[PDB]
Write a structure and sequence with these properties.
mainly beta, 3-stranded antiparallel sheet, elongated, Immunoglobulin-like
Length: 120
């Protein structure tokens, strides 16, 4: 199968990517993100966004919630589907926005550690 990756890990926020190849369209890879929070305070009004290179197409499904709870007591799960008709190496730019300790937090990062199985 396709191994999971840690996509992001900073400021107590961790985002894991798990992967499955679609059963409907073999050019589609279904990514399930899981966002977790190891700090003492919930991350609220949380929004994950993503963009991929021109040859790819992306569809982001509804997240399970808007709160990444403190102490790792649960996660936010959200699915991203990626269409890669020209079988190029997948890479991504993520944008994370949320409130923590009353402040607006926002980070942009690259995910350039996708496993080959995720796109070959």
């Amino acid at each position: 199968m396709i191994p999971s990756i840690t996509a992001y890990s900073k400021n107590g926020l961790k985002i894991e990517f798990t992967f499955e190849r679609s059963n409907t369209n073999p050019s589609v890879t279904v990514i399930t993100i899981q966002a977790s929070n190891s700090t003492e305070l919930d991350m609220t009004d949380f929004v994950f966004q993503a963009a991929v290179p021109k040859t790819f197409q992306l569809q982001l499904l509804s997240p399970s919630s808007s709160v990444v709870p403190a102490f790792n007591t649960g996660t936010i799960t959200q699915v991203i589907k990626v269409l890669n008709p020209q079988k190029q190496q997948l890479r991504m730019r993520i944008k994370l926005t949320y409130n923590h300790k009353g402040s607006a937090m926002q980070d942009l990062a690259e995910v350039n550690n996708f496993p080959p199985q995720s796109w070959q």
